[PDB]
């Protein structure tokens, strides 16, 4: 019934996946439409990548900030508790 | 050929088109997924709405900035320019 995951989840979500994580420390994240979802340790986490920033943005709205080396992984896990949403985009009304 | 336009486009971008015009001057607007298209007169125009702001985002990025005063009508005449796009939002990446 909760499938409808999918459907919310685009071909995009992966890619991304991906790419916030190319070498951090040893984390797994899990791709769900509203929901991101992950694990990880924090011994070799962000370590190549210094102190450098992300901005994640929803409906073209922050949802989510985070630092490379605040490693994500921990950061992420409380996160995903936000429930992303999948397409989303937007104009603002004053 | 060029009908894809249809798939670009979205229901919201309806709602959104009526939207930011709600009583300003004569102005007709057009849904075309990655292009806006109009024409207006500045008689009347955004009279009851003083000076208020607007902000178009795309990808989750900004794409089209105009005042309630500025007539937009005027405004959106030029910006149609930047052939809009359909569905898209974001990550940021470093």
Redesign the interface.
């Known amino acids: 019934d909760n499938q409808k995951a999918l459907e919310e989840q685009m071909n ?1 979500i992966n890619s ?1 996946n991906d ?2 994580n190319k070498g951090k420390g040893k984390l797994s994240l899990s791709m769900n439409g509203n929901q991101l979802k992950a694990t990880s340790s924090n011994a070799g986490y962000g370590i190549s990548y210094e102190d ?10 922050k949802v989510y900030t985070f630092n ?1 080396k605040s490693t994500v992984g921990n950061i992420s896990n409380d996160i995903n508790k936000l429930n992303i949403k999948g ?8």
Not at 52 to 61: A, C, L, T
Not at 87 to 94: F, G, L, N, S, V
């Open positions: 995009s991304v790419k916030l450098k920033n992300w901005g994640i943005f929803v409906n073209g709205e490379e397409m989303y985009i937007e104009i603002k009304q004053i």
